[PDB]
Design a protein around this ligand. Structure first.
Ligand SMILES: C[C@@H]1O[C@@H](O)[C@@H](O)[C@H](O)[C@@H]1O
Ligand SMILES: C[C@@H]1O[C@@H](O)[C@@H](O)[C@H](O)[C@@H]1O
Ligand SMILES: C[C@@H]1O[C@@H](O)[C@@H](O)[C@H](O)[C@@H]1O
Ligand SMILES: C[C@@H]1O[C@@H](O)[C@@H](O)[C@H](O)[C@@H]1O
Ligand SMILES: [Ca+2]
Ligand SMILES: [Ca+2]
Ligand SMILES: [Ca+2]
Ligand SMILES: [Ca+2]
Ligand SMILES: [Ca+2]
Ligand SMILES: [Ca+2]
Ligand SMILES: [Ca+2]
Ligand SMILES: [Ca+2]
Lengths: 114, 114, 114, 114
């Protein structure tokens, strides 16, 4: 099944934050309406924040997260959670190796803002 | 129901990160085994990452998030989600006012790390 | 925070199923647009299905679950999960007593159907 | 990533319920400790409950859901959600075709019972 793809409400501000937990340098790309809108890179084995940004979902609402490590695409897991019918989280983990911890880059998208 | 309380794997490092989306200055307290382990504060209406830290869940694994604004406890919502039977997120929203957006402080706990 | 309230896409069929795990008889009411659309009742300590139905979210999409036992509303917990950006679950637990198992009536809403 | 595999607490009763939404007859097999413990079959486009059953997770706690249509495995999605640090849902969707609604068989696992 496809993972890392989320439909947000149109024309809505959202936060996107990435963390790293791997020996490999993580490159996280965030696409809005199929065009790169943010890119983060960094290395950590201690959950460092490798980037944070606020984006707009635009007319389509389509947001996609991609992760690669030294040009190799990582396998993704994802889901969306809604609390009290208002607070949204889109969650992504990724695996760059063999241990299947799926934390090598972790991406959190949240909305609404403000 | 109680919210913002999570049983983590014992003796395990976890990430905790807080975001602010309110006119009010947020204060986030993270308790491990019923003792304060981290405190974050800030004021933003644009999802600022007012704190991020790595903690250990200790011998009991009990982690609790509390949020206040000008000394008043915020109302909390929370849940935990597990992806691919391994990757964990504990999620908290909070409301300091009357609009019920529940984003005024948002807290994400993630494990495993490394 | 409010629990057991979900906004579905408008005019969309959804399934609702309720389970019982309590000494007490559970009555589950499902409201669409703030009017009762289905009512289930039964008693089990073995997770019996006490009702299942397909409903239409209607023009507003506003669906609410309420649970009563022994003449008093139960305390509710809830969240919504979306898998592969397609498959939606709205989940409710309820507590009618003192043990805080929150399983006394369990309600699952799923969409889309067909 | 692997989907439809969950680790439950050992020696714990749990509920498993399957729904169908497809032209194809769904076959759902629930394995405990790698051995089939329940099987359900049926065709519906209207979310019929093709089976429900209470099982014990046994010494291993390992529970796996498999879905097929006339012997062809369906593609699975899954996640687990915990409410108020106590009430557990393991969720599975499956796709037998090309439309990626992932509802063709839907399986819900819930614990604790009683
Ligand atoms: C330090 C190690 O780096 C990579 O091999 C990751 O895939 C592992 O999960 C671990 O983080
Ligand atoms: C700017 C406003 O600040 C407070 O009133 C918050 O409770 C609102 O949600 C909003 O963020
Ligand atoms: C048999 C018992 O019945 C009620 O007291 C419930 O609140 C308990 O959770 C338990 O199910
Ligand atoms: C009636 C149709 O039957 C199969 O093709 C399913 O894969 C579709 O999702 C739809 O339910
Ligand atoms: Ca890894
Ligand atoms: Ca890792
Ligand atoms: Ca607010
Ligand atoms: Ca706010
Ligand atoms: Ca109870
Ligand atoms: Ca009970
Ligand atoms: Ca399908
Ligand atoms: Ca279908």
């Amino acid at each position: 099944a496809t993972q890392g793809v989320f439909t947000l409400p149109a024309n809505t501000r959202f936060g996107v934050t990435a963390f790293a937990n791997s020996s490999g340098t993580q490159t996280v790309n965030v696409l809005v309406n199929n065009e790169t809108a943010a890119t983060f890179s960094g290395q950590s084995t201690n959950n460092a924040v490798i980037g944070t940004q606020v984006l707009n979902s635009g007319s389509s609402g389509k947001v996609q997260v991609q992760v690669s490590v030294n040009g190799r695409p990582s396998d993704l897991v994802s889901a969306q959670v809604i609390l009290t019918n208002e607070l949204n989280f889109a969650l992504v983990g990724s695996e760059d190796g063999t241990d299947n911890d799926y934390n090598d880059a972790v991406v959190v998208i949240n909305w609404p803002l403000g």
